[PDB]
UniProtKB/Swiss-Prot annotation, chain A:
It comes from Escherichia coli (strain K12). Gene3D superfamilies: ATP-grasp fold, A domain (3.30.1490.20), ATP-grasp fold, B domain (3.30.470.20). Acetyl-CoA carboxylase is a heterohexamer of biotin carboxyl carrier protein, biotin carboxylase and the two subunits of carboxyl transferase in a 2:2 complex. ATP binds at K116, K159, E198, K199, Y200, L201, H206, H233, E273, E285. GO terms for biological process: fatty acid biosynthetic process; malonyl-CoA biosynthetic process; negative regulation of fatty acid biosynthetic process. InterPro entries: ACC_Biotin_Carboxylase, Acetyl_CoA_COase_biotin_COase, ATP-grasp, ATP_grasp_subdomain_1, BC-like_N, Biotin_carboxylation_dom, Biotin_COase_C, CbamoylP_synth_lsu-like_ATP-bd. This is Biotin carboxylase. GO terms for cellular component: acetyl-CoA carboxylase complex; cytoplasm; cytosol. The active site is at R289. Mg(2+) 2 binds at E285, N287.
UniProtKB/Swiss-Prot annotation, chain B:
The keyword Ribonucleoprotein does not apply. The gene is accB. GO terms for biological process: fatty acid biosynthetic process; malonyl-CoA biosynthetic process. The lineage of its organism: Bacteria, Pseudomonadati, Pseudomonadota, Gammaproteobacteria, Enterobacterales. GO terms for cellular component: acetyl-CoA carboxylase complex; cytoplasm; cytosol. The modification N6-biotinyllysine is found at K46. The keyword rRNA-binding does not apply. Homodimer. The chain holds residues 77 to 156 of 156 of the full protein. Keywords: Biotin, Fatty acid biosynthesis, Fatty acid metabolism, Lipid biosynthesis, Lipid metabolism. This protein is a component of the acetyl coenzyme A carboxylase complex; first, biotin carboxylase catalyzes the carboxylation of the carrier protein and then the transcarboxylase transfers the carboxyl group to form malonyl-CoA. Residues 1-80 form the Biotinyl-binding domain. Pathway: Lipid metabolism; fatty acid biosynthesis. One of its GO terms (molecular function) is acetyl-CoA carboxylase activity. This is Biotin carboxyl carrier protein of acetyl-CoA carboxylase.
From Swiss-Prot, chain C:
Residues 120-296 form the ATP-grasp domain. The gene is accC. This protein is a component of the acetyl coenzyme A carboxylase complex; first, biotin carboxylase catalyzes the carboxylation of the carrier protein and then the transcarboxylase transfers the carboxyl group to form malonyl-CoA. Acetyl-CoA carboxylase is a heterohexamer of biotin carboxyl carrier protein, biotin carboxylase and the two subunits of carboxyl transferase in a 2:2 complex. This is Biotin carboxylase.
Length: 443, 80, 425, 77, 427, 423, 78, 77
């Protein structure tokens, strides 16, 4: 057991971690900005420490302040949460070097997966499916280039090395000339006639795989999540499992992700985000941290990912074996944001009346309450509604009623938007792509 | 409350994009900046305060137009 | 499906039924007393109908008013909930003949299990283990009385309509009178069942409801500690065939006293129970939706092999009462905040500004926590209770916290007298 | 300003029988005990009587429309 | 004085009486319906007694319940307030017969002024100016009828309501069974006079109030004093009213309502009780009318003699009602958020608070905002600010309507007639 | 009038000034710290400007920030209120230098009355009664010193306390002597001066109920003060205003013992307890401040100033009523008292958090009555109605004080409250 | 609680018709519809409150000589 | 009066060194820039200076005790 930890975060995730700590009997230290004195988790914590003024840069991104808090409270570990410093290799370094446990992966691992190039390298070497490409620029031999396009599978895309000069090709007959014309364009534009080729994923879905590794050779995968519904590349709705994914495909991608964890010597909780098209996965990134939408995975597997983070940080090996991990039911999550539901303009202010939805399969994750003011700093996400059901349709219906029950007055929220999305027939069908929400709201 | 690294105003005054009425703006969206670089000016009581970047990266957005007043901690610029 | 139903109840259970209905796309009609205009489920219902003044006898026990509401709103069925008219054979009768579906068992079945004597008769007939008794009054013949005590096995108890631990103390201990076996420190263990009234019937594990004050449940949990899968299968299977025998329909519960590995039937609740949610947590079955499905004429979708017990669940009843004197505690809730988190389920109609009227049972909510095991469920419950805020009125929250901290409760298996022994009653 | 409310749930009717005249109309005087309307509940034709004497100011419900307990039916003065 | 009294009312007026009692060290007994358990004054009272179910007829109009309540609590007096039983002669009688003091006028006086005919009789007898009329039905003689119209002065009004403005078509107007005639007051103002009488021969008047702003004859805004009313005119009508009090042997507080047009007053009714809008009078005179009611009921003679009654400043009152501001349908429900206005000269009179439900019974008035000022303009400006500060969420209110009225230029000029508010809203 | 002003303050006084501005049609600019975004007056103001972080030194004491706010909003004047920069001669100076109106007296007047030596001097010259003293040190002659103790009058104080000749000798061992007022009452006189030669006095206030020299309860008029005595001290105060060329609202605080007044200080600004004076005279002191700053001469004549009734004020503080420990936190439920003669002055509301900065005073309850007894009973009731949950308040203490028999008789000295609480 | 017979009026509660008379009911005693459980003196009328549902008396919530209000719980049955 | 608050999280100390004298004591006069105390964070001994001139009314924190951002340390009169 960890004797005492600092929760290096705020809002809902801070409350989530705090709850985990209480259940495991871990003493909590809530570090907070001067504007977050009223945070629920702060009011519930065993010890509190103001670490700076409102702005994130002077508080939750203030490494010296957070570590200093850890020393004066005598904490043994620090939980970074998501965002802020969770994927800051330098932060993890100073934390361990100052004699505290970093509840997360090794700094070296964060750097590895924190860089696009080295991350891709590791995944391929480990057997994790990445985006197929020419693996280097192209030559003048059109037989070779066509062999590469054939292997990869059309459609493909040609991109320039300089830096434009980009072009999608959907058939063999038009590849050669497409390279020529793109090489000319690359030379007249980027002053360099060098090009390369990748697989072109036109309609992908954001499908990500949850994993846990104790950093002692053990690693398991906890099914997947579909987070395709997005605005400006920001997730709005997440669900688990992903519609259309058979248990055999889930086992396919999952086992590869687990072995990858073993290879890079991963530790803690992590996520492998992939683009998903025609039954194929293509690595995008690995979030070396807990994610916002982790709760939907908890609902269908019964695994408490936060408690597992804490157990692993304490040096304990995985108690759960892959065979014992079963997918049951379905879960959806709508992010509740303090913003205008039509213009997405932040909406800080005092919450004049609040009531949380309840009932079978309903899980409310939020720090907000009546009288609590949402400050004009930080991300606009103020809560998360997660509904579970024996199947996808039941989960969605639960979500409809629950959003209808949810009351948040005093500030604008995106609740109405979430209601629209639940009512969206294409979403009810399932399998909408990563462009659909914006494709729906009018480009 | 907008995401991204936010350079906020450290004082009350009038925001300006340029050093002088006829001159070019210190920065533009898409431009690379270094720590210490002047992004704008906040004129307060004859003081021509140059607000500098506290983090290196690319300018994502410029949240205030010239001639407009700004308050303490008001978001001015977003970086990378 | 059912087009529209009347929720013949109030408070938390009324809200529970309403949610079930909204999820199934069933139109809701909330009938309410004049004192219950501010109820959440009333505020959320599609249609509302005031049926009388505050007192239950003039509102929620008002059969003509409720049926009339069903008629004028054009509902097809009526859900009675628990308490009130849920086990009122007469009510079910008039509901049916007035052309409405009674979401529950047949009136004949309610009467059958509504009488102590006839209920026992049915259970023995079905093979359900009952409480040994004299089976008829007692005479002055002491040879007979001692023989009866011998069969039943000491200790025994004499009741009218004194405890005896030995032959020497029988004579004086014995006005119509009868004798039963005395179960000194038993546990309240009950079995959940569903029957479609078409020959199919399944059991959904058991629940322990030993923590009681004045025979009123304070804490419930599922499954019951110490109960092996073989013991569960024994009593469960007997309950299911009993359902088949009496032709039961809807959801029901067989309450038993449990002592030295043996079960003794006490009563069958021919209705949904308050503590049903703990069974839902560990089985994943939505008991209310199943009630509605069965009333709509559908056969059981769940077949016995598919019923699996996973994890553990605890439920603390939240009552508006003085935590030391148990005086009802009506009044306005000035500030309210519900607990949240993994495995936490809050079932309540209360909110900030809502007044708890000086009528009706004092239970205003139910907190239910699920966990991979019993210890996790209990810890979850501690945290959740500490998060729970209800100001303006006294509640038993502090008492529930004490119980979760109780070492004997943490061990599990406390008897039906333990809570009152702890509070010095 | 006196409000005669319904003492029961049912369907409101202005007349003792479908094609008879209404018990009362606006401007008509009534005494305590006089029948003002009917509330049908389960085939029973319940006669609602005045609990105060005066003149009928208003009739708040149309025939064939449902009414609940304590629902305003008539305004009297 | 009075050891303990029952407050036979609810809402704001019940709270007002309770405060008055608390200051005088008088023990309070709040009788309430089952739906008013949450009333502030009930929560503040020394003793509470439920007297019946929600409907007023079984609660606040339940004489036997109220009296028995007084009996078990051992109260000495009962304050009826306004509305309900305040002007119910039988109630006052039964209160006295049970050995309790009725805080109000004599039962005989209530009946006297409670009946149109008997009230008019008394007023003429006392010299209070009433509406000129034909004094009897009219015949077929057009010479007679025209002479009568001449005396009364055109325009005139025909009743069994049809207006004649000139001689030439009077003849036809009679056509449209037996008919009387009155003066037609087309654009009058509701001006009323406050009075106090100890029932021992003394009677004073406390200036007047203008209550012209109305919807369907229901008061929306009141002010004191009334603009355009001179001190000599004030003295004339006021003295008339006081003399009327002495004549009919009035006791307690009362109000003489008049229509006022071109320097003339015309009696309509006497409210034999405290009125809703009494506070504007209190602001400008410094007199606590409720405490005066209690002192008179205790048998004390008027401490104030007419010479000592001084008018200072100006006061306005906007009635706050729980209703849709455009269709005026009652708007019961829970108040989700409440904040009362404050500041110099601001007086908030209401029992409502955050979390309190306005029940679907009783009158829709839930509060009263009263602002005082050195002059009329300052009073109005304060009313603007205070209304803007006033927050009542969860239910619709007429607050926005009150704001429009304060911004109304004709109201700012003052002297608007009893038809103006409905003329402006197009009704 | 003033087109637009900056309210350089917070809390109840800021809300009070804002109301005054709204009634006169003056546009308002609420400058606030980052922690006061939720202040009622801020939410009601026409324009808002954050001027710095929570700490006072970086916000409400931040001169450049406040003047800059006035400049960007185009305000013409700045109202300082009480506390903070209201008596900061430097602040007033810079305000006038930047071309803005300082709603208060001239900077030179602030300095004059801001220094004990020069202030006392001015009072001497103007005829305002001061504390009798040796008026300069004495040397050897003990006959002189003893004669001085007699004239100046025992008991006396050095620079400590001497009650007799026998106890003078040892106590003297530069030195000076003053009159020692052992059991005095805090009596202060309200004044308004247009800075154009006119000056009036608005009766007095008794503020004897104090803890650690901090006023807890105030009332007007002061018990025992005759209209002739009131006219005595009042006229002298007015003359003092004319002499020093005073402008705006001000207060002359005195110690009052055996029918005699002794100058302590002149508060060259509005005071917290001004509302009790407003209740008994009908004068809106804030509105008068604004009119005078607009360049208008006094509309009121001394003759038109009449004392009617009585008013009491209890300060509502966010603190433990027994240990007076600051008590920041969220107010979970609030309800204000109401009724005839009841005046509630506060910015707090349900859901509003009292931050862990600034003074602990969060409101003021002021009750008026035809007489003192009625005012006090009214105060009791209103306090009993006042609900403030979520934080500790001194409400219970105020209740005790209203129930105190010595307070009800009136005339308690400046040491009584601490004498009562055993500290 | 159980089934509650409440007071229909304001008055004074009494357990017996006279000080030296028998109590109408005591805890554990069975009663049927129409049986007198207690008395509430209102006005000159000495009103007898009777049971509206049959069963056994659970509790008596009020002592003799004490006042009662409308809808006040007086007796519990079963 | 004026509160000098902590600009950082750390441990409070009255002296520059364990066996040295305290920077300040109650009643002592100080000017702007003068060191009043130290707040150690991660072995760095940060010197907290006075931001206003005057005399020390109180020293609100004991040596060796932890302090947070904006915590009151010293009061000046």
């Amino acid at each position: 057991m960890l004797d005492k930890i600092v929760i290096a975060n705020r809002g809902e995730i801070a409350l989530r971690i705090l709850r985990a700590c209480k259940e495991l009997g871990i003493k909590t230290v809530a570090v907070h900005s001067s504007a977050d004195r009223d945070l629920k988790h702060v009011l519930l914590a065993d010890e509190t420490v103001c670490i700076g003024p409102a702005p994130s840069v002077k508080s939750y991104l203030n490494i010296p302040a957070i570590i200093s808090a850890a020393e004066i409270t005598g904490a043994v570990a620090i939980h970074p949460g998501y965002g802020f410093l969770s994927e800051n290799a330098n932060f993890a370094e100073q934390v361990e070097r100052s004699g505290f446990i970093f509840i997360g992966p090794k700094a070296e691992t964060i750097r590895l997966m924190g860089d696009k190039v080295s991350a891709i390298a590791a995944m391929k070497k480990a057997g994790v499916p990445c985006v197929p490409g020419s693996d280097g620029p192209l030559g003048d031999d059109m037989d070779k280039n066509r062999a590469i396009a054939k292997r990869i599978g059309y459609p493909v895309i040609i991109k320039a090395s300089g830096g434009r000069g980009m072009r999608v090709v959907r058939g063999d007959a038009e590849l050669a000339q497409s390279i020529s014309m793109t090489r000319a364009e690359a030379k007249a534009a980027f002053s360099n006639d060098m090009v390369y080729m990748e697989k072109y994923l036109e309609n992908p879905r954001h499908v990500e795989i949850q994993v846990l590794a104790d950093g002692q050779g053990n690693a398991i995968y906890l099914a997947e999540r579909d987070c395709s519904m997005q605005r400006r590349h920001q997730k709005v709705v997440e669900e688990a499992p992903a519609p259309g994914i058979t248990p055999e495909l889930r086992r396919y991608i999952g086992e590869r992700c687990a072995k990858a964890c073993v290879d890079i010597g991963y530790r803690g909780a992590g996520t492998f985000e992939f683009l998903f098209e025609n039954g194929e996965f293509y690595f995008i990134e690995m979030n070396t941290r807990i994610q916002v939408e982790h709760p939907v995975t908890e609902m269908i597997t019964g695994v408490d990912l936060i408690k597992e983070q804490l157990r692993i940080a304490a040096g304990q090996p995985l108690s759960i074996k892959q065979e014992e991990v079963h997918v049951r039911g379905h879960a959806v999550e709508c992010r509740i944001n303090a913003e205008d539901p039509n213009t997405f303009l932040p909406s800080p202010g005092k919450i004049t009346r609040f009531h949380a939805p309840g009932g079978f399969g309903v899980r409310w994750e939020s720090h907000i309450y009546a009288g609590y003011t949402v400050p004009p700093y930080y991300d606009s996400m103020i809560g998360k509604l997660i509904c579970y059901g024996e199947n996808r349709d039941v989960a969605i219906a639960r979500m409809k009623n629950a959003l209808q029950e949810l009351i948040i007055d005093g500030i604008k929220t995106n609740v109405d938007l979430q209601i629209r999305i639940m009512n969206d027939e294409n979403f009810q069908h399932g399998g909408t792509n990563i462009h659909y929400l914006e494709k729906k709201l009018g480009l | 409350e907008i995401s991204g690294h936010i350079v906020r105003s450290p004082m009350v005054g009038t925001f300006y994009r340029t050093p002088s009425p006829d001159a070019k703006a210190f920065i533009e969206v898409g431009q690379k900046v270094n720590v210490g670089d002047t992004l704008c000016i906040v004129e307060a009581m004859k003081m021509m305060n140059q607000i500098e970047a506290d983090k290196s990266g690319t300018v994502k957005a410029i949240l205030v137009e010239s001639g407009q007043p700004v308050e303490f901690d008001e978001p001015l610029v977003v970086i990378e």
